[PDB]
Write a protein that binds this ligand. Sequence first.
Ligand code: HEM
Ligand code: HEM
Lengths: 360, 361
Amino acid sequence: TTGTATEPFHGPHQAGIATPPQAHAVFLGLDLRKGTGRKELGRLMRLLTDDARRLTQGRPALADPEPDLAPLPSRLTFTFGFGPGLFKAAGLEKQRPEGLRPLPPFKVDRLEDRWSGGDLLVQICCDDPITLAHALRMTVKDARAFTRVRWVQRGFRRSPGVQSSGATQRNLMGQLDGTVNPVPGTADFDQAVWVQDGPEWLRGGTTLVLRRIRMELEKWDEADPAGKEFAVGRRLTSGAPLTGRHEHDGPDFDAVDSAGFPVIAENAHIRLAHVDSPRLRMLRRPYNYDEGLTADGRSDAGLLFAAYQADIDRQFIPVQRRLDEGGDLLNLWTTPIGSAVFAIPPGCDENGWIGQGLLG
Amino acid sequence: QTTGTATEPFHGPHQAGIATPPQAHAVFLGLDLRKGTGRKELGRLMRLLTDDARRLTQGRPALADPEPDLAPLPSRLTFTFGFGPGLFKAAGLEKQRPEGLRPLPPFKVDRLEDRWSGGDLLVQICCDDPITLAHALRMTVKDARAFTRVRWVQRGFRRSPGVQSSGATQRNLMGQLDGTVNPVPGTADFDQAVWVQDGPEWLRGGTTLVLRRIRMELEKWDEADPAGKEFAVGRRLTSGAPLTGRHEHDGPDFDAVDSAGFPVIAENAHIRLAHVDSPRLRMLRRPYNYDEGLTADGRSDAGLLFAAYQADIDRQFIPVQRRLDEGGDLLNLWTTPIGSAVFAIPPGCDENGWIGQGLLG
Ligand code: HEM
Ligand code: HEM
């Protein structure tokens, strides 16, 4: 049984980033109350740090309302992120990374305030949804005095044990999603993900772009099946690029067909999204969402697109701009409806707290 | 075999999803019939839904599946179909409606909402994997959409597969072990309690389902005295033992008194008011937990999808629910029914039949 497994909470980095993605996630987006300044932010982060320090190791939080739900931690992780408004309220505008600001507008955007923005992120991931529900309850108990809930975004992947560790999993459009990604334990991953420039407090942390993207599954089902593969540039069942045979073959963007036209379309998703230099890649760590049905049977489902990178301006915005300006074929069936950005501090040890180097 | 490749048989004398040890995830899909959906249309629908379930539960794509790659990894997927009271009117088969198939009478604790209540047709889908479940739900809707409107969709969860040993009792979102006293599948008392053997012929080998969405007032629960929380139920939180005993499965001693001469298990303790002596009159509780979103000041929207299966609602559910209500169950201070629905669940089918054929055929 796997309920007893844990992920380390202490370290140079926060967990939940390089951690192989767990089956369940909640992204909790918080807005600061009017009186919540730097002093209050420190009191809040010390509370939340200790909650996570205990719950992730299967121990009840201080003042835990339901201690019996804290055993079976099931690889629970907490990742805390600071939005642009956090630096304003703390009086630390000098410490805000230049690129930490709301993303520029893109033509595909249909963004809603109720899924965008936020001053404080608590990302909670877990292989078990009861442990996750309890961890969310404790977080809100300790954050209530300082913050309002702006949004809560719940997502899922495969249950633990359904697929072998590391195997690519499918999204709700049926596509293998995650083939091209930096790999933890390599020098390229560290360069792509962990901050080493900019303000000193953020070194060893990262940045997160969180976009709620709706899937138009009505239109998608009507779509030509060959057209669906052409829009991505990979086959549905195998995940292979249209130029190859296996999932992990390298897409050949110079290949043309017997008529002279590119095998992978000039506006195929993976052509527009691709970056040559592995150290400029973003870490994609997405979750799926599925939420209820209209009377006439229309789904409300999509992707919680979570991208981690050392530099938003150098690693996320150029890709998103190419998808938009290049007219990504996948845009016919996907729609961004929420967008938020966060600076994720480095980790801490037993005698520290998350954000201490910024707020202390 | 893995958690993803494991299957549950679809064919049998009974529908799966009842005696099946509860899987990690569930969705209860509640449907209303459209105006033109009569007996003929219901037969076409039930044949479509049966064949989709027959395929998907075994890891094969449904007929005309728009996302066939999501159908492998069935992860113990089961479907359970149920017929609400309004179904028999639309089919012209009022004579075949069981006397006891009707909306529950009102109870003082009820704060029922229409958006969580009623329904002509139930599709209960359970699965160890949420992606497989999501795909199965979409295939169900794809085939039912022409004949029905969606009245509600209620999603719930238990522990992930492999988190606890199988058969071990699991906790609810109040932290309580939930499911200790239950008919055990594969026993004679289970068959007597669950499977219908009287009434209209088509329902023999089926059961009845009471589905109640019960909100947990977790703000009040947190402020509650911890001794009072155990006292309200009659069992200890950590061990799950009755207050009169030491281990989870010890029989509660309803005659024991404390040093003051008062019952150790209170007169209005949940397990005292809910208890029935005859094991063959017990209900099968197969609940799921739900947790859906937060107010701006951090108040939870969480509770229990209370799913009770029994041969006879009038003999096995209503008297218990009435004792809880009139007896003033201490647990009522922290729980609120906000939805209620009742369904007749037909017997199973074979490789050539379809669910409901004995009624709609
Ligand atoms: C619902 C929305 C989206 C869906 C369904 C989707 C789907 C996919 C699929 C199927 C692949 C190919 C397999 C893989 O390598 O993971 C892929 C690759 C990729 N996607 Fe997306 N994607 C979405 C949104 C985005 C967005 C908004 C970005 C913004 C930067 C993005 C960036 C990438 C990148 C960088 C790759 C790897 C490309 C390569 O170098 O081969 N995706 N996506
Ligand atoms: C959110 C609402 C409810 C909660 C949290 C809850 C909780 C519990 C708990 C902790 C137990 C003891 C452990 C066990 O045997 O499972 C129990 C037992 C039981 N509950 Fe509930 N319950 C709820 C609603 C109901 C309702 C509405 C009924 C209506 C029939 C019911 C019927 C029973 C029965 C029959 C037992 C077994 C009692 C025995 O014979 O020992 N429960 N419940």
